[PDB]
RNA sequence: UUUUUUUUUUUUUUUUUUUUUUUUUUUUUUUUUUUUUUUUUUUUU
């Protein structure tokens, strides 16, 4: 019920439209996931994931 | 012609000092040369 897959939604602008002030979708709030994700990606020859914090 | 220690004397003989010391240790603290507001490819459509 968060319209995150919907074509033209407000969701992508939750921060700047001031709908939210603490994003659930952020990587700060998703630290473990962000890691494991980028790590696997890197082993799989990603260049994007190379410089991920 | 020599002489054949780039040896030498008079004792001597730590580029040893004793006065006590002896972390080029002080800490009252307090110790990521971390820090928060999201964020977190020196990503772009």
From Swiss-Prot:
It is found in: Virion; Host cytoplasm. RNA binds at residues 22, 53. Belongs to the vesiculovirus nucleocapsid protein family. Encapsidates the genome in a ratio of one N per nine ribonucleotides, protecting it from nucleases. The encapsidated genomic RNA is termed the NC and serves as template for transcription and replication. The nucleocapsid is bullet-shaped with the tip containing 8 turns of a conical spiral before reaching the helical cylindrical trunk. Nucleocapsid assembly is concomitant with replication, therefore viral replication depends on the intracellular concentration of free N, termed N(0). All replicative products are resistant to nucleases. Homomultimerizes to form the nucleocapsid. Binds to viral genomic RNA; this interaction contributes to the virion assembly. N in the nucleocapsid interacts (via C-terminus) with the P protein (via C-terminus); this interaction allows to package the L polymerase in the virion and positions the polymerase on the template, since P acts as a bridge between N and L. N(0) interacts with the P protein; this interaction prevents the uncontrolled aggregation of N(0). Interacts with the matrix protein (inner layer); this interaction contributes to the virion assembly. Interacts with the L polymerase. This is Nucleoprotein. It comes from Vesicular stomatitis Indiana virus (strain San Juan). The gene is N.
């Amino acid at each position: 019920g968060q319209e995150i897959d919907k074509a033209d939604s407000y969701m992508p602008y939750l921060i700047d439209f001031g709908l939210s002030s603490k994003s659930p979708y952020s990587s700060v709030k998703n630290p473990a996931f962000h890691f494991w994700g980028q790590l696997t990606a890197l082993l799989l020859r990603s260049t994007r994931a190379r410089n991920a914090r």
